Design a protein around this ligand. Structure first.
Ligand SMILES: O=c1[nH]n2cc(-c3n[nH]cc3[N+](=O)[O-])cnc2c1Br
Ligand SMILES: O=c1[nH]n2cc(-c3n[nH]cc3[N+](=O)[O-])cnc2c1Br
Ligand SMILES: [Mn+2]
Ligand SMILES: [Mn+2]
Lengths: 138, 138
């Protein structure tokens, strides 16, 4: 029925710092901006920043595990993490899963992630060392 | 340089109803499931449902505008939106103007959307009727 993710929309408290975070720091392409939002792209990903007066800057301990992971090469992983570290971007988790992951927060506390690895690679690793109670479906 | 969305991870309060929602109702492909999570795919989208004791069933007034939109064809949009409402899936936003979108909630209150149209098509429509203060970047 569904063919993929059409877009991701993030509620932001301040449009300008969020645009700066995703365009200048993360390198996404800014396509349009208006008084209450912005459209950016990251590969095939359509990202909408939506100005929301209800959005507070949320500490990572006060939000659940819902998060959004962006693909990055193994070759770029270390330097991109250092770039984030130089900018003072907070880390909310340390990786314990297959593939390289860097868990960082956006200006409003949206939980983000850089990840090296596909679903196929994760499934193959899990076949070798399954999670508790793991069942596979073909 | 980030190349796209690697995966979307949703914190869920009850794994079984969430897996049933995304696999059975939304038709996504179930690849694996374990005691604390599940992996599904929707086209290129890698979806992880993660069992989280911190996740609450959240009414729509209690969360901000952050939401996740899935692509659907023009031919399938109307019948599937009717199927979701007939199945009792809650709607968290109704905009008559936005005929190509259907806003619905998952079992935990994650805000979802069916949308027909790409970013390029949205930009073209926006040039014809811009949002207030809109600026485009070629
Ligand atoms: O997910 C989305 N929400 N949204 C709101 C707007 C918006 N901002 N101001 C008014 C509107 N609107 O027309 O819904 C524009 N685009 C989007 C997307 Br894509
Ligand atoms: O974003 C994700 N978080 N996550 C946790 C797990 C998980 N379940 N149980 C233990 C873990 N873990 O390795 O952290 C598996 N996959 C994922 C993804 Br994809
Ligand atoms: Mn993740
Ligand atoms: Mn939307």
């Amino acid at each position: 029925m569904l063919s993929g993710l059409n877009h991701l929309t993030l509620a932001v408290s301040q449009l300008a710092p969020s645009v700066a975070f995703y365009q200048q720091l993360l390198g996404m392409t800014l396509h349009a901006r208006w008084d209450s939002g912005a459209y950016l792209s990251c590969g095939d990903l359509w990202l909408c920043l939506s100005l929301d007066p209800q959005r507070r800057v949320t500490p990572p301990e006060e939000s659940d595990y819902t998060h959004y992971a962006f693909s990055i090469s193994e070759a770029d992983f270390a330097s991109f993490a250092a770039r984030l570290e130089a900018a003072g971007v907070a880390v909310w988790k340390l990786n314990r899963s297959e593939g390289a992951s860097h868990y960082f927060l956006d200006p409003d506390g949206h939980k983000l992630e850089l990840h090296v690895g596909s679903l196929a690679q994760r499934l193959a690793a899990c076949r070798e060392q399954p999670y508790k109670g793991m069942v596979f479906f073909e």
